[PDB]
Paper text:
C1s is a member of the chymotrypsin-like serine protease family, and it activates the downstream cascade of the classical pathway in the complement system. C1s cleaves its substrates C4 and C2 at Arg-Ala and Arg-Lys bonds, respectively. Because one of the key recognition motifs is the ionic interaction between Asp626 in the S1 pocket of C1s and Arg of the substrate, amidines or guanidines that interact with Asp626 can act as S1 recognition motifs for C1s inhibitors. Thus, in theory, inhibition of C1s could decrease or stop the complement cascade, and therefore, C1s could serve as a novel therapeutic agent for various complement-mediated diseases.
To better understand the structural requirement of the 1-aminophthalazine moiety, we obtained crystal structural information of a 1-aminophthalazine 4e in complex with C1s, which, to the best of our knowledge, was the first report of a cocrystal structure between human C1s and a small-molecule ligand. The structure revealed that the amino moiety at the 1-position of the phthalazine ring and the nitrogen atom at the 2-position made a bidentate interaction with Asp626 in the S1 pocket of C1s as expected, thereby boosting potency. On the basis of the binding pose of 4e cocrystallized with C1s, a structure-based approach was performed to further enhance potency. Furthermore, there are no substituents of 4e located in the S3 site. Therefore, enhancement of affinity in the S2 site and acquisition of a novel interaction in the S3 site were attractive targets for enhancement of C1s inhibitory activity.
Residue numbers in the entry: 364 to 369, 384 to 394, 398, 410 to 411, 413 to 415, 419 to 435, 438 to 498, 501 to 600, ...
């Protein structure tokens, strides 16, 4: 008897890496939602957790994260900077208190060393390296409503280009509410960093570690959405999603926003997880 197996692994959620070659391990399949998101968060539409099974809900500051493996949640630094034991939920379209009673227990929070720590969050101008990892106590059981997202490769076909389409999803501010009750999502293109800089508001810092995204239709993520995955189609498989970006910060809700360029952190991510 192996974990997550019969030897069939429990497919479509797990896969084998098969009195025996070895003389067997069933491990999660990142990136493949059961029902893909259907377009009709600002400028978004209704999303089912099904569409975004990696989506994680942080409660204490209202934020999001992405499940990347059974022990690790990935989020923005700023989201855990001053919440070292965050309350995270998974598996749910509604974040209504009723529906809030699957929860993930944090074991350790790992902030990126290049994040600038602040005692008082208000008026941070510098969101460089807005990336942090959260190790869970118990492994997450995958299914229709809970599965990881893929990470980027360091290969160049992972370099994003202006116009690349991605997904944002969260329970943040909408045109109707300050915090959504049900999951919301939008499709939006990667934009040149000047677009972000041109929204008039010590100056905000823009680094190469930050994706700008947004455009004509004024789709955007906002407060409440932060730490969630900007989900991009795997360069070689259109049905598999990886986290190109993390919802970091933005000059003005409904304009253009800034997302942690995950690719630049893949080595660190990998190393943190191995060494822990
Ligand atoms: C500091 C903190 C810690 C925990 C939870 C929330 C916060 C928080 O309050 N902030 C973090 C997220 N943030 C963004 C991010 C993207 C935006 C965007 N893309 N467009 N318009 C506005 C945007 C605003 C607002 C400030």
């Amino acid at each position: 008897s192996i974990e997550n197996g019969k030897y069939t692994c429990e497919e479509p959620y797990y896969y084998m890496e098969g009195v025996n070659v070895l003389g067997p391990k069933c491990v999660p399949v990142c990136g493949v939602p059961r029902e893909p998101f259907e377009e009709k968060i600002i400028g978004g539409s209704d999303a089912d957790i099904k569409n975004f099974p990696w989506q994680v809900f942080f409660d204490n500051p209202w934020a999001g994260g992405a499940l990347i493996n059974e022990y690790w949640v990935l989020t923005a630094a700023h989201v855990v900077e001053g919440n070292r034991e965050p309350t995270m939920y998974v598996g749910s379209t509604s974040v209504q208190t009723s529906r809030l009673a699957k929860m993930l227990t944090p074991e350790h929070v790992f902030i990126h060393p290049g994040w600038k720590l602040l005692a008082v969050p208000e008026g941070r101008t510098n969101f460089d390296n807005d990336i942090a990892l959260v190790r869970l106590k118990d492994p997450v059981k995958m299914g229709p409503t809970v599965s990881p997202i893929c990470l980027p490769g360091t290969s160049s076909d992972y370099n994003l280009m202006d116009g690349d389409l991605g997904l944002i999803s969260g329970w943040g501010r909408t045109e109707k509410r300050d915090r959504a009750v049900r999951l919301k999502a939008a499709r939006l293109p990667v934009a040149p960093l000047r677009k972000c800089k041109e929204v008039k508001v010590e100056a905000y810092v823009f680094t190469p570690n930050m994706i700008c995204a947004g455009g004509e239709k004024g789709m955007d993520s906002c407060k409440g959405d932060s730490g969630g995955a900007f989900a991009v189609q795997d360069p070689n498989d259109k049905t598999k999603f990886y986290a190109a970006g993390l919802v970091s910060w933005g000059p003005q809700c409904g304009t253009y926003g800034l997302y942690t360029r995950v690719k630049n952190y893949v080595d660190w991510i990998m190393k943190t997880m191995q060494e822990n």
